[PDB]
Design a protein around this ligand. Structure first.
Ligand SMILES: CCn1c(=O)[nH]c(=O)c2c1nc(Cc1cn3c(n1)CCCC3)n2Cc1cccc(C(=O)NC[C@H](N)C(=O)OC)c1
Ligand SMILES: [Fe+3]
Length: 290
C-alpha cells in the first residue's frame, strides 16, 4: 500500500505541521540552551511557521540588531570565499539576490521577497518550517518546488554554530542555487521520486539529497567547486572541502546512498557530480531500481 503523499502544493499544509522535533525545543548542546530570551524568540519563529498556510504571504520579521550583526559577520566571511570556492551557478545568482532581495551585510532578507524571486526564476517557493520533518515530508515539498525554510537566526554567542540549519544557511546556502533552472529541476526530481515511495527508497533519496543539495561538490572546467548548501554556509568546512585533506569520490547514487550522514563534525567524504544535468541523469537511472 502506497503511503499518503501530497497531490498539490496546498497539501503540504498537512505535511508541514507534522514536526517531529520543534525548533524551540533546542539541543542540549545548543548555544542558546540556557538563554531564556533566545528560547522565547525561537518559539515566536516556530509559531509563525506553525500558523502558516499555503497561499499566505510569508510573515515578515523585524530581526534584532543582534540578529543582523550575526548575519553580517557570516555574510562578510563567506563572501570572501565564494569566488574561489563556489560553483559558477552559485556565483551567477548571488548578485541578483543582492539587487532584488536585499542581500547586504546590514540586512537579513525576508523569506517572502526571496520566495517571490524564486517563483519568477524557477517556480520555486519558500515555506517557513517550525522544525525537523520526516525525510518523507521534507522531500515531498520539493515535488512542488517548495523548500521548507527555517526563519530564525543562529545564537549570537556562537556565530559559527553549524549543526542545525538557520535562516543564514537557507539564504546563503540554498537560495542562490534554487534560482538556477538546472538545479531546480534536479531538486524537484528528488521530490517527485519520493512521493509515495517505500520507506527504504525515501531514506536512500534523502542520503543522495544530503551529498548533493547539502554537501555536494562539482567539477567545472577541471576544477572542484562547491554547490552543497551546508558547505556554502559553513566557513570552516567550505575551506576544508576544497583542501587536500578531504576524501573525495565520484557521485554514484548506488554507492552514495550507503554513506552515513554526519551531523556534528565535517563530512568524512564528499561526492563530486560532473554537472547538475549529469547528477539528474544518474538519479533517474537510480530511482527506477528502487
Ligand atoms: C533530508 C534530511 N532532512 C530530513 O529528513 N528532515 C528535515 O527536516 C530536513 C532534512 N534536511 C533538512 C535541511 C538541512 C539540514 N541540515 C542542513 N540543511 C544543513 C546542515 C545541517 C543539517 N531538513 C530541514 C530541517 C529543518 C529543521 C531542522 C533540521 C535539522 O536537521 N535539525 C537538526 C536535527 N535533525 C535535530 O532535529 O536535532 C538533532 C532540518
Ligand atoms: Fe540545508
Amino acid at each position: 500500500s502506497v503511503p499518503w503523499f501530497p497531490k498539490k502544493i496546498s497539501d503540504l499544509d498537512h505535511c508541514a505541521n507534522r514536526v517531529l522535533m520543534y525548533g524551540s525545543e533546542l539541543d542540549a548542546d545548543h548555544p542558546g540552551f540556557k538563554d531564556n530570551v533566545y528560547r522565547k524568540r525561537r518559539k515566536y519563529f516556530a509559531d509563525l511557521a506553525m500558523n502558516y498556510k499555503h497561499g499566505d504571504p510569508i510573515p515578515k520579521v523585524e530581526f534584532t540588531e543582534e540578529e543582523i550583526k550575526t548575519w553580517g559577520t557570516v555574510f562578510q566571511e563567506l563572501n570572501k570565499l565564494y569566488p574561489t570556492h563556489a560553483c559558477r551557478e552559485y556565483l551567477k545568482n548571488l548578485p541578483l539576490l543582492s539587487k532584488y532581495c536585499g542581500y547586504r551585510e546590514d540586512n537579513i532578507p525576508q523569506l517572502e521577497d526571496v520566495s517571490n524571486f524564486l517563483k519568477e526564476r524557477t517556480g520555486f517557493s519558500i515555506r517557513p518550517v517550525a522544525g525537523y520533518l520526516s525525510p518523507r515530508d521534507f522531500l515531498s515539498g520539493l515535488a512542488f518546488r517548495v523548500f521548507h525554510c527555517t526563519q530564525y537566526v543562529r545564537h549570537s554567542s556562537d556565530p559559527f554554530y553549524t549543526p542545525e540549519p538557520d535562516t543564514c544557511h537557507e539564504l546563503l546556502g540554498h537560495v542562490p542555487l534554487l534560482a538556477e533552472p538546472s538545479f531546480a529541476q534536479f531538486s524537484q526530481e528528488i521530490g517527485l521520486a519520493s512521493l509515495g515511495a517505500s520507506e527504504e527508497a525515501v531514506q536512500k533519496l534523502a542520503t543522495c539529497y544530503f551529498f548533493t543539495v547539502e554537501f555536494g561538490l562539482c567539477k567545472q572546467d577541471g576544477q572542484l567547486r562547491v554547490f552543497g548548501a551546508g558547505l556554502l554556509s559553513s566557513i570552516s568546512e567550505l575551506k576544508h572541502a576544497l583542501s587536500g585533506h578531504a576524501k573525495v569520490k565520484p557521485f554514484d547514487p548506488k554507492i552514495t546512498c550507503k554513506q552515513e550522514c554526519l551531523i556534528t563534525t565535517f563530512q568524512d567524504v564528499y561526492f563530486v557530480s560532473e554537472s547538475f544535468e549529469d547528477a539528474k541523469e544518474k538519479m533517474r537511472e537510480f530511482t527506477k531500481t528502487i
